Chain length 134, copies 12
């Protein structure tokens, strides 16, 4: 039923095409179509992201996570995500493999159920659809 | 309209859960639902895979590619895929980031539109859905 | 007399065996037995940890620090800890050397007085005992 | 006209020679002499630094940035700084090349207009003078 | 009841502060206070160290081990230590992380229960106290 | 009073914008304004550069050095520069961190007082101003 | 009873001492002496090797494999070999450790039961003898 | 007299400027002018390339080889080429040193007589001319 | 006629399945069957192993060597083994390639005639059989 | 019309077979046959080589360059060569890929039109022929 | 007056040219000529070498040390040698830089006064002469 | 009879203890005592050093070479030195192994007869004595 979509640093700057408010609206609409409720949250603060992941761990709710630059750098976020019992889908809007070498390593991928990159904002919608069939 | 799904070495051994024939049937059914025609092919021969990629290049048809172990090893396959003008979506059934370090490098990812890993056979269906909306 | 025990990200999630509140109680009891006063604080926010380290620097108070994942990643925390004049003991509950390779590097160890790993929550109590004899 | 000077973690601890309040006063005085207005801000919180960089991006204002330890570690800060359209000058008080090897890599340098290191607090004043002539 | 304390090469040269004979006396006194019997042995010969570890394996006795330079170099010692069923605590007098890079790798740490470094000879006494509570 | 500005290989090719003769004129004008005398010299010969550095060592005169490609390659030049007692400021016109990886290492930076990169020819003028206040 | 001996690229060129036909005859003779039936096959085509490995997986038959240069390069072959339930013995005629560094890594060794190198064609016969006693 | 020109994977796709059929015609014309007979063959199959190299080894005929992506990846092809007694000239149309780092390593170069890169299809003609004078 | 079997550190601990005394008995029985005399020796002391290798060098006798952890670490043992004129077969009971990365390098393999790993104690018997046919 | 052939350090020592004077004569003869004028120069001085490259840049003349050991070491020479507008062909007499690993990296190759190695002094003549057809 | 010459593993095998007994005689003769007394000792046992180094530390006597393979591998020997107050000269008979890469690193060189390699047994005599003038 | 002593960049700056003129005098005196003639030359120019090495190659005269920083950087100097038929002794005044890591690699050591480091100016005199006995 409930799916958490958690966006990390700089994702509030989307579109400055699709803005973060637009993304929320798109996700909510898709979720309803699939019979799910999407809770979409964004923060530039690692501590706030950690708190949202802790809550999803306690509730056994799935998480779709685009951690922004913290993907590549945060062991703390990995440690929190490792506690999740429900699925964790990592999403990147851009194809990180076509950019700098440092973007090709993720602390999150090894502990995620799966990873979608380079499909733009549709990545989020495809992750929802995976969770609805699972 | 037409989407090519190309599976590389050892993918004929799926299920020995879901068999390769079953996967073909699942993909075909999903494609029809989306208004697409899926052409699904599998080979253990790099040369045969190259030929199928060349044909998709000449026809300007999108490709969903699970190259199996060649993902990690074949520059020749990368070179062929670089010629494609329509989208290229790389799919892995397993989460390659939760396995050996060598599986975490792909010669294909940098030249793909995007990459889906770890979502099992649903990865193929989600890639179809991306192409139908694009 | 006064010893600061500072716990970083995810340490509030201990026990979800020993909870963080239990750990506080254990530390306080041991401190009193040794003739010390323990001030035990936890935060998921790097900025908050930095502030507590700055205060210990200004007061010339010893610090027992379990920085969680920031151990492996934060130069900022190292820089703050380098200002401490009293002893700094790094503690990890788990044996970081029996886990992923990335956990085997610490930005803090080179600037600490010493390091205790893998002795569970007793590590904290043993660090207190070192400080009481020093 | 307006230049933002942004100082990151631990820079509030300057002088505990020149204190952070003194640095602000020095910068403001130099700015006025050059016909500029300097807005000088410091934070130990990455999220707060990100917000200030976002604002400078939206206003098309130049930034002089001493990110402290985040220089070496934060992809998130790089990503925010990449959005700036006006110049970005990276400043370090110390000569990072005469210290530990890890300080010799910066996530910011590749995206900065230029970089001044090792000239102490005069680095800030020299960066102002560059911006006044540009 | 019985704890073996095993010191490797060059540890007989302690104090030429605290000498190796003094260390033995300190350990024995602490052990008695904790209700334990400490058997403290030192050798510069890897073969002799191996024999003492084999005996502790056969007797299921805990070991506190400061292997000196062999920490960094001996796979043979690791292999012997891997046979121990009771706890193994690695101790270094100095903080190996504040010295040459080569001292920051240990063949023993991954197979130890835990590791104490940089607390001087008190490290041995703290390891005894861990074993008495375990 | 006297400051030496030493330019290495290929710097005579500046402008083929600002030519090397123009740069000399700009530097001389700025120096006079600051109450300094600038001696500006350029050579493509490492031996000649070494001789000029030796002379500045013997006279205890400050040096502003843009060694061109020798920055990245010459231990001999580092060794000569290490003898200087007065300040040494390394200047690069381009932002070397936005170019090939090999340009991001300098044999000179560790032994320089400070380093200015990416501010174009103004880097030289800013280095003069540092020396006038020091 | 049945053992498959599979030789990869360039092994048909043996002796141009012992030729590949001679090797087949030697293996067959040894197999009969041990009460086994040896099926010896060679191909320069990875796809053909994969097919033979798939068949041995389906039949639960042991495999003695000299993959030639594919040893060092093929993840696809590793993936096929990982499916085998009966033993897999890797054989090299030459001592790969006395040659180029690249020959000292094998994608197959980690998944093999064991590995024999440098014993010439007797390696094959010794592998047969292992399988007869197992 | 006879020279073999062997082209590997994707070289049949030349011109989709100069097509592979055109290249054959150009080579044949140049060969005749030099008093040579050129046998030009292309395949996307490693096994087929191996067979052609084996035949050139048996006939003691020179080889001009553009192995395409296999240059960078195939130990099997190196092993076959090592058997050649007549000269082996490696040719690349593109300048592999101006592309991705992975293209700057060749398994073939160490065993070739020489290597021509970046001179386009004229590289083949220049290799013929070398063989005619040798 | 005479073959030396030399076992290094920790091999006396075999079976605490097959014990070291049992292994000796098995080897002796196999040797007699092959018309050989096996001299089997074990030591945890590198110096003692060196002496036995020196004696085999002086007598021009073949050696089957399982150096235990010294395989991975001892240049001294390599240097002694390099003096042997008769064959040297390296044996490991376990498949070192399926364990830690550090076990995948041997100082001995490059100087050995050949290497058998992962075939358990039968490895020793197979090495004897090689020497009997050679 | 005019082609510069520039030889770097130690190339004056050719033949102490073909001497440097002989090479000049061979090149001049070939050039005339092709309708070109070859200007062949050699120096052991990097500064002198730089000057000759600067002149070829100013005249928009092609360069055939064998930089000797500077190939592997000089960023200054790369920087000068990057200014050339006409083609730059790098030539090595020896096959650098069959020698020490350090010879397999060139600072020049990425900025050259193409590279010929291992064809002896004919490499120079083949480079002339490329330039005559281009 | 007294100089210790300490030879490590395998040095007793010299000449099986100059034997170890001959070397002793040569050293003793040279020492007497210089007014010194040479005590020359050899062992294959690290523990024995450590003891001899400890004694030289306690007596403040200079040491000429050829540690054989332990040069490259023993931190324990480095640690003992670091205690010496009188000079320490490292000697190798062979030129270790012309052999395998692993021989080009020494744990001893950084703590030695100096190092002589590749001058054969004369290296020992030259080291004596250094000590006589110092 | 004749020995060349060649000093590279910055060696003319010795003593600004022993000056370069003093070193020449010391060497000449020692040479005469040994029945040799020493020709001692110094230059900061690589080209000049190359010329002196070429002359020693042509005359078959031994060389004692302290190349200064070029030791670590010049392939050209290595190439010239490789031509020498008489002995080549590399000398460093300082112990390069006790300094920066980059000083621990020499392009010259592999091609030298031997190497003396860290014995100060006596290194030169000891090298002369080696050549007199050889
Ligand atoms: C571009 C984004 C949002 C980002 O912040 C980067 O640091 C990251 O490498 C990729 C990213 O998460 C994305 O493409 O979604
Ligand atoms: C398991 C598959 C099919 C494979 O062949 C592996 O080599 C590859 O690393 C991952 C893979 O492509 C997949 O999970 O789809
Ligand atoms: C498990 C803890 C708390 C942690 O957060 C990890 O990131 C770290 O590697 C180890 C750790 O600090 C610990 O074991 O105390
Ligand atoms: C010393 C400062 C402020 C810092 O925090 C360090 O992490 C950084 O490497 C250098 C630094 O930014 C500086 O010198 O300004
Ligand atoms: C200093 C000691 C004893 C030692 O022998 C070193 O090799 C090791 O790195 C650290 C050490 O074990 C210690 O500090 O106890
Ligand atoms: C471009 C310059 C002058 C140069 O020669 C390069 O080798 C160097 O990497 C940067 C440089 O010194 C500069 O930008 O001033
Ligand atoms: C020599 C062989 C057959 C081979 O093809 C090489 O690529 C490989 O490194 C070793 C090899 O498999 C062998 O020695 O059997
Ligand atoms: C472009 C070609 C043909 C190729 O297939 C690449 O994999 C290779 O790196 C270079 C290449 O062989 C060539 O430029 O001829
Ligand atoms: C397990 C043995 C005996 C050993 O001591 C390890 O150090 C080595 O990596 C492998 C080993 O020699 C063996 O498996 O025979
Ligand atoms: C042998 C030559 C001339 C040379 O000086 C080497 O440093 C270089 O690696 C190769 C070389 O340029 C050549 O083969 O032409
Ligand atoms: C050859 C010697 C004696 C040795 O034992 C090697 O391990 C070492 O690399 C060099 C050596 O010490 C020597 O040449 O004196
Ligand atoms: C100090 C010297 C002269 C030098 O120039 C350095 O570059 C080199 O690393 C060591 C040196 O050659 C020496 O100590 O003789
Ligand atoms: Na929720
Ligand atoms: Na990871
Ligand atoms: Na999209
Ligand atoms: Na199709
Ligand atoms: Na890639
Ligand atoms: Na699925
Ligand atoms: Na407090
Ligand atoms: Na560190
Ligand atoms: Na505990
Ligand atoms: Na502002
Ligand atoms: Na970067
Ligand atoms: Na300042
Ligand atoms: Na005991
Ligand atoms: Na380890
Ligand atoms: Na202590
Ligand atoms: Na001057
Ligand atoms: Na450096
Ligand atoms: Na400028
Ligand atoms: Na079969
Ligand atoms: Na592997
Ligand atoms: Na054989
Ligand atoms: Na043919
Ligand atoms: Na190679
Ligand atoms: Na062309
Ligand atoms: Na014997
Ligand atoms: Na080796
Ligand atoms: Na067995
Ligand atoms: Na010209
Ligand atoms: Na390059
Ligand atoms: Na030639
Ligand atoms: Na003595
Ligand atoms: Na070292
Ligand atoms: Na000698
Ligand atoms: Na001379
Ligand atoms: Na070298
Ligand atoms: Na001296």
């Amino acid at each position: 039923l409930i799916v958490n979509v958690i966006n990390g640093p700089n994702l509030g700057r989307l579109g400055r095409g699709t803005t973060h408010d637009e993304l929320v609206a798109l996700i909510e609409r898709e979720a309803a179509e699939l019979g799910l409720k999407a809770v979409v949250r964004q923060s530039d603060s690692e501590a706030q992201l950690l708190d949202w992941i802790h809550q999803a761990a306690d509730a056994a709710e799935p998480v779709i996570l685009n951690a922004g630059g913290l993907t590549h750098t945060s062991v703390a976020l990995r440690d929190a995500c490792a506690e999740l019992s429900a699925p964790l889908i990592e999403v990147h809007i851009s194809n990180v493999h076509a950019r700098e070498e440092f973007r090709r390593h993720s602390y999150l991928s090894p502990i995620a159920t799966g990873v979608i990159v380079g499909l733009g904002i549709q990545g989020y919608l495809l992750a929802l659809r995976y969770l609805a069939e699972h």
